Structures are given as structure tokens and as C-alpha cells.
Design a protein around this ligand. Sequence first.
Ligand SMILES: Cc1nc(-c2ccc(C(F)(F)F)cc2)sc1C(=O)O
Lengths: 188, 188
Amino acid sequence: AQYEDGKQYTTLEKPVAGAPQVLEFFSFFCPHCYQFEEVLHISDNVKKKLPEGVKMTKYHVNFMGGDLGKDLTQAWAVAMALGVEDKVTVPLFEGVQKTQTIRSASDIRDVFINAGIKGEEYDAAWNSFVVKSLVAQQEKAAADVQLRGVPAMFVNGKYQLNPQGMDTSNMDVFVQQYADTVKYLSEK
Amino acid sequence: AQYEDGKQYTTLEKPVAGAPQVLEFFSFFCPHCYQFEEVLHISDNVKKKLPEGVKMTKYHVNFMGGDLGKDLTQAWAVAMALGVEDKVTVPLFEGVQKTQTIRSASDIRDVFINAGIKGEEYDAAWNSFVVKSLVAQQEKAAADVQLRGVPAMFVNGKYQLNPQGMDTSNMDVFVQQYADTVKYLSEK
Ligand SMILES: Cc1nc(-c2ccc(C(F)(F)F)cc2)sc1C(=O)O
């Protein structure tokens, strides 16, 4: 791999200060986001190659979800607040897109309860100031990088991953090129 | 429901003569269209609510996806001509938006093959004047209603569905309101 601005990544005209080191955006409605997370395991594969100390951040957005989309963003805030992202990401993606068992906020709550989060705890977090702030943070971060679509990933508020210019003849190779690019950018 | 023009539906300025009773437009590149098919099953649920004998028509549009977009419109003509819409809708949607493995006309052809359509039969259809006419029909129909985006549904060439004005907190409530609006308009 030979890295060039415009090839594996692009450079934001307006860099974001104080941005997370590695910031990924997604939506539980987004088919290619399902592909990224549930099939390719982009987040996990990127994390595996990240330099020690560099943490990953993942935010939910709402391009095609209406009110339910907003519920999902707030629920993702709850997942972050409780630190249970690795417990609810799979049943949320599956429930929305595959089994079609997630149709409302109540169904989202049921997913957390089934994953081991007590209903009272979910509700406390849901109505918490921490989650209210996390919802605002997700929205602001999207605005800051002038987010146009998902999935997307940004490194140090400066660089935007560009998977269009990566090898896709093989999904295993794509994942490695993608993850290697994040590693490279994080080291810049 | 209190139906109001501008809320659940809009009224075309110049209604289309001889227009299909129920006419849907979509694109395989269209994210809400993907949702309308896989998660909400709008067409199925509208059909269920309408009387037996109301014709539903669904056309593909050109203005998403560049050259592959035109190819998909021709491919949808093939599907209509062969009567295999239900065999190819999901793998076309997922090939375009989920796995992104549909990149050329050849990839579209592969989907039809894998869905059981004999290759020689696809090719004969692809190059047929019956299909050429169906492509023209889809384009003319969109032009007749001055189509600006997808998804879109028109009733009796008079009214256009307005999902933006509907409740989006619960998927099944949205589908119910959508289908109920179509029935209301059909009886107007
Ligand atoms: C076509 C469309 N469709 C929308 C939608 C449909 C269903 C739902 C939910 F299922 F979540 F209820 C949300 C948004 S918004 C929308 C638009 O063009 O504004």
C-alpha cells in the first residue's frame, strides 16, 4: 500500500478540534452499515490494528429513520452510557433489518432487557443528563465533519476514510486495506 | 384520520389521463426504497388493504446511480416482462446497497441467473423490443407526474402520497397510515 491524499482517504477542508481519535458513524437502518459491522467486522478489525492507547468511538445518526431513528440514536447513547455496545449492537442490527422485531422504542428497550440490562436501569439511563448530552454529542460530531452519509470513519478530526478507492475483489482484503489505512492515519 | 391535502398526500396540478390506479416509483439505489421493500413491505401492505382487482404498478427510475442506474431500469423491464419481480427484488437491492457487489450490467445478469432465470432467456429479454417499450413506458410515466424523487406513489394519476406527513415513531403504525391513505385516495 502507498498512501495518497484522495486515494485511501480524503482530508477535511475544516479540521475538527478535540474530535475522537477514531470516529465511526453508522445507522441501524443502514444496509451497508449492517454489512460493515455484522459481516465485515470493520470496527473490530480496525481496533485490532490500532496503536495501543488509541480508542475507537462510534456514533449513531439518523438519515432515514424519522422519530424511530431518533429513538435509536438515544438508545445508542444509552448503550454508550452503560458500556454495553458489545452486547446490543448485534440484536439491534438483526432486530431492525433481519427479523423485523424492532418496530418501536419499546422493542429497543426489550433488546436491552434481554441482553441483561434491567428495565429500571435502562429507563434511568434513557432519561439521564449523561444520555441527553451524548445525544447532543453525536449530532454535533456529525455536523462538525459535515457528514453526508454512512458508514463513515474519521481519524483525528482531519482525515476521512475513502473505501471507494480500495480493493473489493475480496472482502477479507478490503477489511485489511481499510484497517491498515486507519492505522496509517492514526500514526500521522 | 383527518385527511388533509398537504398532510398525508398532495394533489397533482395537472392529473394524468389513463394513469395506473396505483403507481409506485423506486430505485435500487434509493435507501428509503430499500426500507420500503425489506422492512416495511409497503407494496404488500397496500395491496392487502386495497380491494381485489385494483391494479398496482411499480416502475424503476433513472436518476439514481449513473449508468448502472439506467441498466437497472432496463433490468426491471426484463423482470416485468418475465414476471420475476419477486425473484430479483431482494438480491438487486442487497447487491446494490448492502454488499455493493453489483457494479455492472454483468453483475445484474448474474443476479437473474442465480434467481433461477435461464441466461439465454435473460439475454433475449434484455435485447427485446418488448423490454425497450417497457423502458420507455417507465420513463414516460415518471415524466407524466413530473417525478422528482423516490420512493413515490401516485393514486389514479391525481394524488401523491406524502410519507413525510405521517407518524414515524412505530414502523407498523407508519405502514398502516400509509396503506390507509392509499385506500382513502383510491375511493375518492
Ligand atoms: C419516504 C420517507 N419514508 C420515511 C420513513 C418511513 C418509516 C419510518 C419508520 F418505519 F421508522 F416508522 C421512518 C421514516 S421519511 C420519508 C421522506 O421522504 O421524508
